[PDB]
mmCIF file of C-alpha atoms in Angstrom:
data_model
loop_
_atom_site.group_PDB
_atom_site.id
_atom_site.type_symbol
_atom_site.label_atom_id
_atom_site.label_comp_id
_atom_site.label_asym_id
_atom_site.label_seq_id
_atom_site.Cartn_x
_atom_site.Cartn_y
_atom_site.Cartn_z
ATOM 1 C CA UNK A 1 4.779 -29.672 11.805
ATOM 2 C CA UNK A 2 8.695 -29.041 12.618
ATOM 3 C CA UNK A 3 9.440 -28.406 8.994
ATOM 4 C CA UNK A 4 6.412 -26.585 8.185
ATOM 5 C CA UNK A 5 6.877 -24.308 11.260
ATOM 6 C CA UNK A 6 10.590 -23.895 10.288
ATOM 7 C CA UNK A 7 9.458 -22.906 6.673
ATOM 8 C CA UNK A 8 7.015 -20.360 7.901
ATOM 9 C CA UNK A 9 9.383 -18.816 10.369
ATOM 10 C CA UNK A 10 11.754 -18.298 7.390
ATOM 11 C CA UNK A 11 9.193 -16.942 5.048
ATOM 12 C CA UNK A 12 7.724 -14.424 7.819
ATOM 13 C CA UNK A 13 11.640 -13.316 8.892
ATOM 14 C CA UNK A 14 12.081 -12.858 4.963
ATOM 15 C CA UNK A 15 8.726 -11.503 4.084
ATOM 16 C CA UNK A 16 9.678 -8.029 3.287
ATOM 17 C CA UNK A 17 12.401 -9.110 0.985
ATOM 18 C CA UNK A 18 14.180 -5.963 0.042
ATOM 19 C CA UNK A 19 10.938 -4.091 0.608
ATOM 20 C CA UNK A 20 11.921 -2.787 4.070
ATOM 21 C CA UNK A 21 9.040 -1.012 5.801
ATOM 22 C CA UNK A 22 6.552 -1.883 2.885
ATOM 23 C CA UNK A 23 3.127 -3.265 3.395
ATOM 24 C CA UNK A 24 2.693 -7.011 2.797
ATOM 25 C CA UNK A 25 0.196 -7.603 -0.166
ATOM 26 C CA UNK A 26 -3.101 -9.082 0.894
ATOM 27 C CA UNK A 27 -2.438 -12.020 -1.327
ATOM 28 C CA UNK A 28 0.727 -12.822 0.829
ATOM 29 C CA UNK A 29 -1.423 -12.351 4.030
ATOM 30 C CA UNK A 30 -3.882 -15.096 2.486
ATOM 31 C CA UNK A 31 -1.072 -17.225 1.549
ATOM 32 C CA UNK A 32 0.384 -17.113 5.279
ATOM 33 C CA UNK A 33 -3.073 -17.545 6.348
ATOM 34 C CA UNK A 34 -3.295 -20.881 4.212
ATOM 35 C CA UNK A 35 0.178 -21.887 5.324
ATOM 36 C CA UNK A 36 -0.589 -21.393 8.983
ATOM 37 C CA UNK A 37 -4.000 -23.213 8.552
ATOM 38 C CA UNK A 38 -2.294 -26.328 6.829
ATOM 39 C CA UNK A 39 0.581 -26.028 9.594
ATOM 40 C CA UNK A 40 -2.373 -26.262 12.263
ATOM 41 C CA UNK A 41 -3.852 -29.229 10.200
ATOM 42 C CA UNK A 42 -0.220 -30.742 10.314
ATOM 43 C CA UNK A 43 0.758 -31.043 13.937
ATOM 44 C CA UNK B 6 19.988 -4.070 0.615
ATOM 45 C CA UNK B 7 19.805 -3.342 -3.124
ATOM 46 C CA UNK B 8 16.658 -4.104 -4.802
ATOM 47 C CA UNK B 9 17.384 -6.227 -7.799
ATOM 48 C CA UNK B 10 15.850 -5.226 -10.995
ATOM 49 C CA UNK B 11 13.605 -8.267 -11.266
ATOM 50 C CA UNK B 12 11.868 -7.188 -7.912
ATOM 51 C CA UNK B 13 11.509 -3.707 -8.831
ATOM 52 C CA UNK B 14 10.107 -4.478 -12.206
ATOM 53 C CA UNK B 15 7.307 -6.788 -10.322
ATOM 54 C CA UNK B 16 6.355 -4.529 -7.691
ATOM 55 C CA UNK B 17 6.113 -1.300 -9.996
ATOM 56 C CA UNK B 18 3.953 -3.145 -12.720
ATOM 57 C CA UNK B 19 0.280 -1.924 -13.092
ATOM 58 C CA UNK B 20 -1.797 -3.871 -10.221
ATOM 59 C CA UNK B 21 -4.341 -2.806 -7.536
ATOM 60 C CA UNK B 22 -2.652 -0.556 -4.926
ATOM 61 C CA UNK B 23 -4.102 0.932 -1.693
ATOM 62 C CA UNK B 24 -4.678 4.491 -2.739
ATOM 63 C CA UNK B 25 -5.890 7.403 -0.665
ATOM 64 C CA UNK B 26 -8.692 9.167 -2.638
ATOM 65 C CA UNK B 27 -10.506 12.385 -1.703
ATOM 66 C CA UNK B 28 -14.294 11.666 -1.083
ATOM 67 C CA UNK B 29 -15.092 14.699 -3.355
ATOM 68 C CA UNK B 30 -13.444 12.918 -6.159
ATOM 69 C CA UNK B 31 -15.950 10.271 -5.876
ATOM 70 C CA UNK B 32 -18.827 12.313 -4.872
ATOM 71 C CA UNK B 33 -17.858 15.477 -7.030
ATOM 72 C CA UNK B 34 -21.881 16.709 -7.098
ATOM 73 C CA UNK B 35 -21.928 16.902 -3.211
ATOM 74 C CA UNK B 36 -22.749 20.657 -2.348
ATOM 75 C CA UNK B 37 -24.452 20.016 0.932
ATOM 76 C CA UNK B 38 -21.614 18.386 3.066
ATOM 77 C CA UNK B 39 -17.884 18.343 3.886
ATOM 78 C CA UNK B 40 -16.474 14.760 4.820
ATOM 79 C CA UNK B 41 -14.414 13.371 7.669
ATOM 80 C CA UNK B 42 -12.093 11.767 6.898
ATOM 81 C CA UNK B 43 -11.673 13.944 3.729
ATOM 82 C CA UNK B 44 -10.084 10.842 2.139
ATOM 83 C CA UNK B 45 -10.630 7.159 2.049
ATOM 84 C CA UNK B 46 -8.184 4.168 1.472
ATOM 85 C CA UNK B 47 -9.286 2.146 -1.692
ATOM 86 C CA UNK B 48 -7.895 -0.479 -3.858
ATOM 87 C CA UNK B 49 -6.953 1.349 -7.372
ATOM 88 C CA UNK B 50 -4.970 0.630 -10.492
ATOM 89 C CA UNK B 51 -1.532 2.061 -10.069
ATOM 90 C CA UNK B 52 2.001 1.643 -11.127
ATOM 91 C CA UNK B 53 3.377 1.677 -14.492
ATOM 92 C CA UNK B 54 3.063 -0.103 -18.036
ATOM 93 C CA UNK B 55 6.478 1.057 -19.305
ATOM 94 C CA UNK B 56 4.930 1.947 -22.751
ATOM 95 C CA UNK B 57 3.901 5.533 -23.436
ATOM 96 C CA UNK B 58 0.966 3.811 -25.683
ATOM 97 C CA UNK B 59 -0.168 1.435 -22.842
ATOM 98 C CA UNK B 60 -1.925 2.650 -19.605
ATOM 99 C CA UNK B 61 -3.034 0.721 -16.443
ATOM 100 C CA UNK B 62 -6.962 0.146 -16.241
ATOM 101 C CA UNK B 63 -9.210 -1.747 -14.086
ATOM 102 C CA UNK B 64 -10.718 -5.159 -15.574
ATOM 103 C CA UNK B 65 -12.609 -6.111 -12.276
ATOM 104 C CA UNK B 66 -14.326 -3.905 -9.984
ATOM 105 C CA UNK B 67 -16.282 -4.054 -6.764
ATOM 106 C CA UNK B 68 -17.625 -1.750 -4.112
ATOM 107 C CA UNK B 69 -16.840 -1.161 -0.316
ATOM 108 C CA UNK B 70 -18.917 0.408 2.114
ATOM 109 C CA UNK B 71 -17.600 2.830 4.912
ATOM 110 C CA UNK B 72 -19.067 4.985 7.543
ATOM 111 C CA UNK B 73 -18.190 8.636 6.750
ATOM 112 C CA UNK B 74 -18.815 11.596 8.997
ATOM 113 C CA UNK B 75 -20.851 14.498 7.271
ATOM 114 C CA UNK B 76 -20.592 17.911 8.185
ATOM 115 C CA UNK B 77 -22.890 20.594 7.234
ATOM 116 C CA UNK B 78 -23.271 24.519 8.640
ATOM 117 C CA UNK B 79 -25.572 24.792 11.745
ATOM 118 C CA UNK B 80 -26.177 21.230 12.296
ATOM 119 C CA UNK B 81 -24.632 18.229 14.244
ATOM 120 C CA UNK B 82 -22.130 15.957 12.522
ATOM 121 C CA UNK B 83 -23.745 13.031 10.890
ATOM 122 C CA UNK B 84 -22.302 9.430 10.422
ATOM 123 C CA UNK B 85 -23.400 7.750 7.496
ATOM 124 C CA UNK B 86 -22.685 4.691 5.073
ATOM 125 C CA UNK B 87 -21.096 5.722 1.609
ATOM 126 C CA UNK B 88 -20.127 3.340 -1.233
ATOM 127 C CA UNK B 89 -16.816 3.624 -3.122
ATOM 128 C CA UNK B 90 -15.639 1.678 -6.207
ATOM 129 C CA UNK B 91 -12.816 -0.745 -5.840
ATOM 130 C CA UNK B 92 -10.446 -2.197 -8.268
ATOM 131 C CA UNK B 93 -9.620 -5.778 -8.229
ATOM 132 C CA UNK B 94 -7.769 -6.413 -11.336
ATOM 133 C CA UNK B 95 -5.605 -4.233 -13.800
ATOM 134 C CA UNK B 96 -4.252 -4.629 -17.080
ATOM 135 C CA UNK B 97 -1.991 -2.592 -19.329
ATOM 136 C CA UNK B 98 -4.266 -1.625 -22.352
ATOM 137 C CA UNK B 99 -3.647 0.565 -25.360
ATOM 138 C CA UNK B 100 -4.542 4.221 -24.741
ATOM 139 C CA UNK C 1 1.618 -27.296 19.545
ATOM 140 C CA UNK C 2 -1.939 -27.619 17.596
ATOM 141 C CA UNK C 3 -3.430 -25.247 20.330
ATOM 142 C CA UNK C 4 -0.931 -22.585 19.980
ATOM 143 C CA UNK C 5 -1.365 -22.748 16.190
ATOM 144 C CA UNK C 6 -5.169 -22.532 16.527
ATOM 145 C CA UNK C 7 -4.666 -19.433 18.567
ATOM 146 C CA UNK C 8 -2.191 -17.791 16.146
ATOM 147 C CA UNK C 9 -4.545 -18.679 13.027
ATOM 148 C CA UNK C 10 -7.315 -16.720 14.726
ATOM 149 C CA UNK C 11 -5.186 -13.900 15.506
ATOM 150 C CA UNK C 12 -3.885 -13.897 11.741
ATOM 151 C CA UNK C 13 -7.322 -14.164 10.525
ATOM 152 C CA UNK C 14 -8.236 -11.037 12.883
ATOM 153 C CA UNK C 15 -5.772 -8.579 10.975
ATOM 154 C CA UNK C 16 -7.784 -8.091 7.719
ATOM 155 C CA UNK C 17 -10.823 -6.759 9.542
ATOM 156 C CA UNK C 18 -13.192 -5.214 6.808
ATOM 157 C CA UNK C 19 -9.886 -4.271 4.758
ATOM 158 C CA UNK C 20 -10.518 -7.116 2.042
ATOM 159 C CA UNK C 21 -7.997 -6.847 -0.789
ATOM 160 C CA UNK C 22 -5.962 -4.479 1.213
ATOM 161 C CA UNK C 23 -2.295 -4.824 2.247
ATOM 162 C CA UNK C 24 -1.202 -5.015 5.841
ATOM 163 C CA UNK C 25 1.779 -3.300 7.940
ATOM 164 C CA UNK C 26 4.566 -5.881 8.579
ATOM 165 C CA UNK C 27 4.483 -4.510 12.180
ATOM 166 C CA UNK C 28 1.055 -6.344 12.521
ATOM 167 C CA UNK C 29 2.684 -9.696 11.968
ATOM 168 C CA UNK C 30 5.324 -9.514 14.854
ATOM 169 C CA UNK C 31 2.846 -11.053 17.244
ATOM 170 C CA UNK C 32 3.252 -14.311 14.925
ATOM 171 C CA UNK C 33 7.122 -14.196 14.523
ATOM 172 C CA UNK C 34 7.444 -14.120 18.262
ATOM 173 C CA UNK C 35 5.041 -16.931 18.910
ATOM 174 C CA UNK C 36 6.391 -19.306 15.985
ATOM 175 C CA UNK C 37 9.809 -18.884 17.751
ATOM 176 C CA UNK C 38 8.011 -19.849 21.090
ATOM 177 C CA UNK C 39 6.890 -23.124 19.442
ATOM 178 C CA UNK C 40 10.395 -24.413 18.009
ATOM 179 C CA UNK C 41 11.812 -26.191 21.061
ATOM 180 C CA UNK C 42 8.654 -26.042 23.004
ATOM 181 C CA UNK C 43 6.284 -27.482 20.395
ATOM 182 C CA UNK D 7 -19.339 -1.797 6.485
ATOM 183 C CA UNK D 8 -16.054 -0.427 7.463
ATOM 184 C CA UNK D 9 -16.755 1.477 11.008
ATOM 185 C CA UNK D 10 -15.866 5.204 11.128
ATOM 186 C CA UNK D 11 -12.836 4.999 13.663
ATOM 187 C CA UNK D 12 -11.479 2.079 11.192
ATOM 188 C CA UNK D 13 -11.751 4.494 8.034
ATOM 189 C CA UNK D 14 -10.483 7.528 9.949
ATOM 190 C CA UNK D 15 -7.405 5.981 11.352
ATOM 191 C CA UNK D 16 -6.586 4.104 8.169
ATOM 192 C CA UNK D 17 -6.783 7.449 6.176
ATOM 193 C CA UNK D 18 -4.926 9.704 8.393
ATOM 194 C CA UNK D 19 -1.441 10.882 7.452
ATOM 195 C CA UNK D 20 0.954 8.013 7.376
ATOM 196 C CA UNK D 21 3.288 6.480 5.038
ATOM 197 C CA UNK D 22 1.833 4.696 2.245
ATOM 198 C CA UNK D 23 3.373 2.648 -0.580
ATOM 199 C CA UNK D 24 3.081 5.321 -3.505
ATOM 200 C CA UNK D 25 4.194 4.603 -7.303
ATOM 201 C CA UNK D 26 6.566 7.404 -8.147
ATOM 202 C CA UNK D 27 7.643 8.241 -11.740
ATOM 203 C CA UNK D 28 11.259 8.305 -11.629
ATOM 204 C CA UNK D 29 11.414 11.575 -13.413
ATOM 205 C CA UNK D 30 9.666 13.247 -10.400
ATOM 206 C CA UNK D 31 12.705 12.060 -8.468
ATOM 207 C CA UNK D 32 15.530 12.575 -10.975
ATOM 208 C CA UNK D 33 14.196 15.727 -13.041
ATOM 209 C CA UNK D 34 17.722 16.074 -14.293
ATOM 210 C CA UNK D 35 17.668 12.509 -15.845
ATOM 211 C CA UNK D 36 15.095 13.319 -18.288
ATOM 212 C CA UNK D 37 17.681 12.350 -21.277
ATOM 213 C CA UNK D 38 16.938 8.650 -20.319
ATOM 214 C CA UNK D 39 14.027 6.213 -20.736
ATOM 215 C CA UNK D 40 13.867 4.359 -17.215
ATOM 216 C CA UNK D 41 12.474 0.797 -17.123
ATOM 217 C CA UNK D 42 10.372 0.587 -14.795
ATOM 218 C CA UNK D 43 9.375 4.112 -15.351
ATOM 219 C CA UNK D 44 7.923 4.285 -11.804
ATOM 220 C CA UNK D 45 9.182 2.884 -8.545
ATOM 221 C CA UNK D 46 7.317 2.006 -5.459
ATOM 222 C CA UNK D 47 8.212 4.120 -2.356
ATOM 223 C CA UNK D 48 6.965 4.721 1.131
ATOM 224 C CA UNK D 49 5.591 8.419 1.071
ATOM 225 C CA UNK D 50 3.493 10.288 3.290
ATOM 226 C CA UNK D 51 -0.203 10.349 2.152
ATOM 227 C CA UNK D 52 -3.651 10.435 3.456
ATOM 228 C CA UNK D 53 -5.448 13.311 5.145
ATOM 229 C CA UNK D 54 -5.101 15.799 7.960
ATOM 230 C CA UNK D 55 -8.741 16.683 8.079
ATOM 231 C CA UNK D 56 -7.854 20.643 8.212
ATOM 232 C CA UNK D 57 -7.108 22.505 5.214
ATOM 233 C CA UNK D 58 -4.337 24.549 7.425
ATOM 234 C CA UNK D 59 -2.494 21.119 7.757
ATOM 235 C CA UNK D 60 -0.344 19.079 5.579
ATOM 236 C CA UNK D 61 1.156 15.628 5.749
ATOM 237 C CA UNK D 62 5.045 15.840 6.090
ATOM 238 C CA UNK D 63 7.674 13.312 6.919
ATOM 239 C CA UNK D 64 9.298 13.583 10.459
ATOM 240 C CA UNK D 65 11.600 10.504 9.586
ATOM 241 C CA UNK D 66 13.505 9.610 6.331
ATOM 242 C CA UNK D 67 15.832 6.844 4.799
ATOM 243 C CA UNK D 68 16.840 5.822 1.398
ATOM 244 C CA UNK D 69 16.277 2.762 -0.558
ATOM 245 C CA UNK D 70 18.518 1.931 -3.699
ATOM 246 C CA UNK D 71 17.135 -0.083 -6.627
ATOM 247 C CA UNK D 72 18.509 -1.511 -9.971
ATOM 248 C CA UNK D 73 16.765 0.363 -12.830
ATOM 249 C CA UNK D 74 17.189 0.062 -16.378
ATOM 250 C CA UNK D 75 18.218 3.204 -18.272
ATOM 251 C CA UNK D 76 18.365 3.762 -22.005
ATOM 252 C CA UNK D 77 19.776 6.641 -24.003
ATOM 253 C CA UNK D 78 17.589 6.342 -27.350
ATOM 254 C CA UNK D 79 20.908 5.587 -29.047
ATOM 255 C CA UNK D 80 23.122 3.415 -26.825
ATOM 256 C CA UNK D 81 22.227 -0.256 -25.484
ATOM 257 C CA UNK D 82 20.315 -0.643 -22.242
ATOM 258 C CA UNK D 83 22.260 -0.423 -19.032
ATOM 259 C CA UNK D 84 21.098 -1.593 -15.492
ATOM 260 C CA UNK D 85 22.197 0.800 -12.732
ATOM 261 C CA UNK D 86 21.557 1.634 -9.062
ATOM 262 C CA UNK D 87 19.449 4.654 -8.008
ATOM 263 C CA UNK D 88 18.583 5.957 -4.604
ATOM 264 C CA UNK D 89 15.219 7.352 -3.535
ATOM 265 C CA UNK D 90 14.095 9.065 -0.368
ATOM 266 C CA UNK D 91 11.668 7.150 1.731
ATOM 267 C CA UNK D 92 9.338 8.407 4.391
ATOM 268 C CA UNK D 93 9.218 6.335 7.710
ATOM 269 C CA UNK D 94 7.141 8.752 9.876
ATOM 270 C CA UNK D 95 4.687 11.499 9.032
ATOM 271 C CA UNK D 96 2.695 14.310 10.821
ATOM 272 C CA UNK D 97 0.079 16.884 10.222
ATOM 273 C CA UNK D 98 1.913 20.274 10.375
ATOM 274 C CA UNK D 99 0.550 23.791 9.693
ATOM 275 C CA UNK D 100 1.226 25.010 5.940
ATOM 276 C CA UNK D 101 2.079 28.373 7.252
#
């Protein structure tokens, strides 16, 4: 939970990379949804 | 702050991108109506193949249905379903 | 923590709407960034 | 089905990721071949739903990218290039 939470935090914070103001590809949203679901099942 | 070469190359390369497409480009034989909105957001192949002999073309397609307002002289606005072609996968292919 | 995560999974699942395959604006993820900070020392 | 108000709002004049050929931005650098040949930029797009209006920027910024540049004689160089971004857009009268 804690480390998976910290991981998702750091991924969301960094999510733009250098692409400031750019939309987040659907694939990345699905990856986040999967990570958040795996984080719910963890915890 | 500088976008590294590797990142520019990955994000520019031929792939489906949200594209604002004029409905008349999809329904060129519509004579009766004008549309609101006039454009729709569609996923369409775009970006570059970095070879003037290559072009970015769809290899997988699907449809999306949207409610569009259809406006005609001397009558009320209609709202009706219209279907548009989506690109799901793209490849750089010889012209 | 698992309850908060359920809420956020639902909210994240809510962003796509009918826009299958479409990117999202990074602004639409702010709720999640704020909420995962609120789960660190909390959860 | 995408409901009318969802289509209308997503189509309306706003910054969209737009794949722009570098020669459009650097028309005076056509002695070079750029790789990639296009870059993804945020640029006003979508529709104003009024032939009298155009979608124009009201807030702008710059982004710097590493781009490969080739004189057909010498070797590949990788150099920074700056591009104008659009951060906010409005429908404004053409005239």
